[PDB]
Amino acid sequence: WALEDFEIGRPLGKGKFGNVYLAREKQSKFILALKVLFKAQLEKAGVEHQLRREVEIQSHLRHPNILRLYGYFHDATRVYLILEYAPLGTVYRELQKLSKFDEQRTATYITELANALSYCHSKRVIHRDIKPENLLLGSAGELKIADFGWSVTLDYLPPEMIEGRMHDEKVDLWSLGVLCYEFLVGKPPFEANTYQETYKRISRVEFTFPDFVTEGARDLISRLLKHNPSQRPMLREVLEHPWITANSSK
Amino acid sequence: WALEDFEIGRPLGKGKFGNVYLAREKQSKFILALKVLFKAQLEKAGVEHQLRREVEIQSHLRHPNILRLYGYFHDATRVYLILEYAPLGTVYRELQKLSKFDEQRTATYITELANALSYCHSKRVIHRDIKPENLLLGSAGELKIADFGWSVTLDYLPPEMIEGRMHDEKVDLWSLGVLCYEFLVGKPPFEANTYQETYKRISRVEFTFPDFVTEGARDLISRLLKHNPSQRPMLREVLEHPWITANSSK
Numbered sequence: 001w002a003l004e005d006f007e008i009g010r011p012l013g014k015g016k017f018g019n020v021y022l023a024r025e026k027q028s029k030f031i032l033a034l035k036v037l038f039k040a041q042l043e044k045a046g047v048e049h050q051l052r053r054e055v056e057i058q059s060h061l062r063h064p065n066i067l068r069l070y071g072y073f074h075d076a077t078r079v080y081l082i083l084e085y086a087p088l089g090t091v092y093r094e095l096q097k098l099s100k101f102d103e104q105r106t107a108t109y110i111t112e113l114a115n116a117l118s119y120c121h122s123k124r125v126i127h128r129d130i131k132p133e134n135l136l137l138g139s140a141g142e143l144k145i146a147d148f149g150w151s152v153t154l155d156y157l158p159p160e161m162i163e164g165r166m167h168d169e170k171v172d173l174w175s176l177g178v179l180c181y182e183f184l185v186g187k188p189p190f191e192a193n194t195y196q197e198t199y200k201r202i203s204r205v206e207f208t209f210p211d212f213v214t215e216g217a218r219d220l221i222s223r224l225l226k227h228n229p230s231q232r233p234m235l236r237e238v239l240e241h242p243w244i245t246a247n248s249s250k
Numbered sequence: 251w252a253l254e255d256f257e258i259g260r261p262l263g264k265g266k267f268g269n270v271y272l273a274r275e276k277q278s279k280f281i282l283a284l285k286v287l288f289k290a291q292l293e294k295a296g297v298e299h300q301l302r303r304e305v306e307i308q309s310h311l312r313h314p315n316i317l318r319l320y321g322y323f324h325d326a327t328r329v330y331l332i333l334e335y336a337p338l339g340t341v342y343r344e345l346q347k348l349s350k351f352d353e354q355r356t357a358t359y360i361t362e363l364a365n366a367l368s369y370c371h372s373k374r375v376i377h378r379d380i381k382p383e384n385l386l387l388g389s390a391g392e393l394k395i396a397d398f399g400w401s402v403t404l405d406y407l408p409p410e411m412i413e414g415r416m417h418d419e420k421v422d423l424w425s426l427g428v429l430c431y432e433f434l435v436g437k438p439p440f441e442a443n444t445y446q447e448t449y450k451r452i453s454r455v456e457f458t459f460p461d462f463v464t465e466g467a468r469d470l471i472s473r474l475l476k477h478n479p480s481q482r483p484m485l486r487e488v489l490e491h492p493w494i495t496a497n498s499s500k
């Protein structure tokens with residue numbers, strides 16, 4: 001692949017490393033998104049090798065609820081990512097438009113996200129925290145995880161220094177809890193006017209529900225937002241949750 | 251400080267970044283050790299900034315059981331560390347010479363190490379794993395910790411991603427347990443012919459004592475070698491341990 005193979009359209013985002021544009025392959029006329037990253041900006045932040053690894057993992061993930069990376073190429077100065085175009089944009093814009101989502105739309109979104117996370121678990125691929133700005137919508141309204149957050153002397157070392165990352169798979173369970181609350185309420189559960197107060201609310205797990213949040217939704221969110229990561233449910237338990245099975249379309 | 255201020259003696263160690271030499275300040279005739287580190291080798295391993303930080307922390311630590319860093323300087327290519335000279339060298343060589351240490355010598359060493367670790371705790375300075383090759387002996391036989399191992403969007407983050415390093419202060423408690431066993435037995439507790447078998451023995455906390463290890467020493471080692479870091483004792487509990495208070499000269 002080379003830049004000349006693509007016709008460029010409007011910008012779809014401006015970042016620290018580079019920009020994203022709507023594009024189309026000149027020959028096939030296939031609509032996609034091209035993200036440009038500057039090699040020197042990546043090397044300055046020490047994320048160059050980290051990008052190579054995430055891009056390698058992202059290349060082999062094929063799921064309706066994960067934004068597809070069709071490929072990548074580079075020239076002497078830039079790295080180019082050929083990504084799926086999600087025509088309905090970020091779920092954050094849809095949340096601003098509707099104020100809050102009903103229980104069916106929320107449960108369906110949670111299902112899609114847990115499905116994408118379960119598909120990755122089976123490939124021993126782990127995901128970090130999920131933000132709504134990093135969730136895009138396909139034409140058939142399917143949510144898509146669109147971030148670059150995928151992961152895959154001895155005698156004197158303690159078990160915690162040799163065993164490796166123990167509960168990194170449990171960060172995204174907390175994310176599902178935050179997102180399920182945000183989708184139903186219209187705001188994240190630990191929101192506060194200061195950083196210190198937001199920090200305190202998260203650390204003390206201090207959240208309450210407005211009166212309109214139903215008992216089933218309260219049960220799932222309370223099981224996801226556990227201080228102790230090992231006490232958060234497995235993804236299969238989320239997919240089998242009675243509030244999820246009663247309200248999800250998928 | 252500059253290199254010309256020092257007379258150089260014999261080498262005291264050859265490393266990846268540079269070498270260590272006995273030295274003496276030309277004017278005062280004060281005996282010390284000079285460690286040379288090559289800036290380009292540090293930058294190649296991405297440890298340059300990490301050295302700056304540890305050297306800054308090490309500069310303000312003054313304790314009889316911590317190897318003193320009197321100062322540091324640099325030229326265009328190298329970093330120089332002015333260190334205390336510990337005439338009796340590494341405790342590892344003494345352990346090879348004696349085969350194993352008696353209970354008084356072991357309890358006194360543990361006391362010195364826990365004292366150095368407690369002094370650092372009070373300054374909110376944390377230490378990593380301790381190896382016998384990194385423990386030096388002063389002329390009056392005091393043990394000295396001689397390593398460079400000292401340490402000092404929000405809405406969507408889980409408590410484990412915002413709270414910071416939780417039990418890093420508990421790595422050195424496991425180290426005291428390993429060292430206390432090594433000092434009394436003559437070999438580390440999880441030693442095995444393969445890496446995989448050593449890995450298994452540490453992870454499963456599989457250790458046994460030869461018949462000569464006394465009950466008091468067994469009690470302290472068993473309390474230190476806990477799989478769960480939060481269950482390891484506080485440093486004050488080690489210093490107040492009845493086996494320690496009965497056998498330590500300090």
Ligand SMILES: Cc1cc(Nc2ccc(F)c(C[C@@]3(C(=O)O)CCN(Cc4cccc(Cl)c4F)[C@H](C)C3)n2)n[nH]1
Nearest residue numbers: 012013020033083084085086087088089090133134146
């Ligand atoms: C890569 C891509 C964009 C797309 N669809 C689309 C359609 C309409 C539209 F307006 C926009 C722009 C956004 C919006 O406001 O909805 C959504 C995307 N983020 C950037 C952005 C966030 C996360 C990952 C990536 Cl890779 C990324 F670019 C910007 C800030 C705002 N995007 N399909 N595939």
Ligand SMILES: Cc1cc(Nc2ccc(F)c(C[C@@]3(C(=O)O)CCN(Cc4cccc(Cl)c4F)[C@H](C)C3)n2)n[nH]1
Nearest residue numbers: 262263270283333334335336337338339340383384396
């Ligand atoms: C910095 C210093 C050395 C010293 N005393 C001394 C006296 C006799 C003698 F032989 C030696 C050499 C050693 C030995 O065999 O005992 C001990 C030191 N390690 C290196 C080494 C390990 C950890 C930190 C540092 Cl900084 C370091 F250099 C080498 C491998 C072997 N050192 N006082 N202060």
